[PDB]
């Protein structure tokens, strides 16, 4: 695991099965960005599955707002979120960036470089990156 | 033990409660525009419905389980799905305790109902509805927290 920001962690496939660190990190919600992959054995840890493959043609944007709202509520309740995908490089990086934009008032550049600074391999696929820019322009418009 | 029918029930707008059979009624879920399944259990299988986000709230139907700790974060995910124009399915094995408690808390937290009327809506939609005594205690505490 990697702490991206206060109360926000990013991880790869095995992260949800590291039950003892999840309790150490105070993780209370795992966001599992996949269609086929196992939930955390972690007891007492809620898990939200966002069902998309790591492929540019899948619609992640449609899930961003309700997933970020779940994450923020978990943080505001005094817990922390772990966002993870198979590689810990695209899907989970995309959701982490979207979260930082929606609830920590960052731009894509500064949000993604927060993510990249915690997880160097971070690299949302180009379709997700386009959807992240569209997500930002939606956040601009509502302002 | 086969769960009490029907598979799923409308409790209130954009909000359905269900038993084990609910997650296995994929076409009713798509017809109702359910965009979020709330699986209130440790061991029940998620909605075999594809592309629908699923939130597991890991508790047994046991009075010593802390459901209260999950309420605020579960209710906010449900509200976000409702606001985006979809619907939520809250389900537990029997469709009587865990899922009824979460539906009740959701009505209190985001539709401004008291515990009395939130549960009255749940029980009217699902007559067997009965949060176990520990869950009821946690609902009473959640209500007094919401007042303050």
Swiss-Prot record, chain B:
pH dependence: Optimum pH is 6.0.
Span of domain Tyrosine-protein phosphatase: 6-148
A Gene Ontology biological process term: dephosphorylation
Catalyzed chemical reaction(s): O-phospho-L-tyrosyl-[protein] + H2O = L-tyrosyl-[protein] + phosphate; O-phospho-L-seryl-[protein] + H2O = L-seryl-[protein] + phosphate; O-phospho-L-threonyl-[protein] + H2O = L-threonyl-[protein] + phosphate
Keyword Endoplasmic reticulum: no
Alphabetized GO MF terms: phosphatase activity; protein serine/threonine phosphatase activity; protein tyrosine phosphatase activity
Active site: 92 (phosphocysteine intermediate)
Impact after mutating residue 94 to A: Increases activity with phosphotyrosine
EC code: 3.1.3.16, 3.1.3.48
UniProt entry tagged with the keyword Hydrolase: yes
Keywords: Hydrolase, Protein phosphatase
Lineage top rank: taxon: Eukaryota
Function description: Has phosphatase activity with the synthetic substrate 6,8-difluoro-4-methylumbelliferyl phosphate (in vitro). Has almost no detectable activity with phosphotyrosine, even less activity with phosphothreonine and displays complete lack of activity with phosphoserine. The poor activity with phosphotyrosine may be due to steric hindrance by bulky amino acid sidechains that obstruct access to the active site.
Quaternary organization: Monomer.
Family label: Belongs to the protein-tyrosine phosphatase family. Non-receptor class dual specificity subfamily.
Protein name listed in UniProt: Dual specificity phosphatase 28
Gene that produces this protein: DUSP28
